[PDB]
Amino acid sequence: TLAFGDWIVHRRWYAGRSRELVSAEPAVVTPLRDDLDHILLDVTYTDGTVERYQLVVRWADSPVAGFGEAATIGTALGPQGERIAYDALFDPDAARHLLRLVDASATVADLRFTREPGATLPLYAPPKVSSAEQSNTSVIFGKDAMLKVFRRVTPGINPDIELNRVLAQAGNRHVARLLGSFETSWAGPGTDRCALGMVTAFAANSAEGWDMATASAREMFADVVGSDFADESYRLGNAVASVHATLAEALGTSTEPFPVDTVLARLQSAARSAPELAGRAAAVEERYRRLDGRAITVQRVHGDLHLGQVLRTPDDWLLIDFEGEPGQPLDERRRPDSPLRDVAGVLRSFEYAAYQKLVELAPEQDADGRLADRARNWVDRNSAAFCAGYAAVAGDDPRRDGDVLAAYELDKAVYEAAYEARFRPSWLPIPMRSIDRILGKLAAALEHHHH
Ligand SMILES: [Mg+2]
């Protein structure tokens, strides 16, 4: 008996949105220590839907200084008197205990922990909660590993754990290597699995691709595009193609028709959010319909790839965060898709990294368009370098199937336009300019005029 409902609604990882909660009750309580409980908490809404959250509770018989407001869940009487319930993920000892359960591949009631074979976990290292992690809770152990504990939990195979495991077990170096994970069942022993968390190698001294790209795209007086960031873009292309190759080998490839109806439905929806799109919708639809019946090769992919999802360590580019297409249910997130769609996601990301500058300037600051010209030249240079690096590993240039590639870029830009129109109108010119450019790129490719 803790007032879970009163506490959870204030948490940044709580996704109740505006909704009235009917109840918030533990579905399963699993003791880990005499003062540590693992809880699956079911929150029920007025429409009858239930959303499950994972909580770990540290009990204290007296107020413990280290915990702040967000980590204080409530109070209850126990067998030795009054107790305060804290969010145990903010307790270094409790976080270390979870890491030790992973290390041992322990089974505690219906909780199953597993250490990846041959992995070493930093049981000695100081645990610190990462403030950057928003949707889940992450605890970084020294400079060696990160424990990510899922907050909202759902049944089925977790794609981030699944694909990271495939990549690590195959020896692919372009990941933050999976070191362990843990899970439970959805409705007691013998029912659907429910992933609970993961442990990955942590890279100190890394840089986010988006930060490196934007720094390059902002260098003053850089009218002659430089080779240093092109070299990085090439190495990034190598890494993405290497990840795709490992995934294709492990999880297979297959053929499907280009998904004309799906991209048309996205276009129809987007055009409702962004009226600017109506003027382009007929042209977009024509290009998509030219792909009706086109067979495409599909495989397991990253699914939400952009420069925010890649890290440069001193030695390599890594891809992270394989949960898949945002907003989609788990089954959909595990569908195979074209590797060219992941390539398209990086190309869109280059466009934003260069053109963010322009939407933030006053018109008078680029009256003759010379900074816009530089942005275009920078995107072209680094897109070519990325595709070339991809080709060097894949043995096939993504630009070869240029029609399919451009159609995926176009579908992303249509979706971006709807987003910017709703949430950031000043950024709308970025995907609108892309749509007109890509319409020509795609028309050229559909006629086999691309290089
Ligand atoms: Mg991410």
Author numbering: 2 to 452
Task: Show passages lifted from the paper.
MakMvan crystallized in the orthorhombic space group P2221 and diffracted to 1.47 Å resolution. The protein displays an elongated concave-shaped structure that can be divided into two half-lobes with a central narrow acidic channel (~9 Å-wide and 30 Å-long), delineated by a positively charged surface patch on the N-terminal lobe and a negatively charged region on the C-terminal lobe, and displaying basic character at its exit site. The N-terminal lobe can be divided into two subdomains: a cap N-terminal subdomain comprising the first 88 amino acid residues (blue) and an intermediate subdomain composed of an anti-parallel β-sheet flanked by two helices (green). The C-terminal lobe is mostly α-helical (dark red). Analysis of the B-factor distribution reveals that the cap subdomain has the highest values for the atomic temperature factors and the C-terminal domain the lowest, suggesting that the N-terminal lobe, in particular the cap region, is more dynamic. As observed in related ELKs, His303 (HGD motif) stacks with Phe323 of the magnesium-coordinating DFE motif in the structure of free MakMvan. In the structure of free MakMvan the largest pocket identified (pocket 1) is located to the left of the exposed catalytic cleft and delineated by strictly conserved residues within the C-terminal lobe (dark blue spheres). Pocket 1 is close to the active site HGD motif and includes Asp305, topologically equivalent to the catalytic base in analogous enzymes (e.g. MTR32), and globally coincident with the substrate-binding region in structurally related ELKs. However, considering the overall higher conservation of pocket 1 in MakMvan three-dimensional structure, which is topologically equivalent to the substrate-binding region in other ELKs, this cavity most likely represents the maltose-binding site.
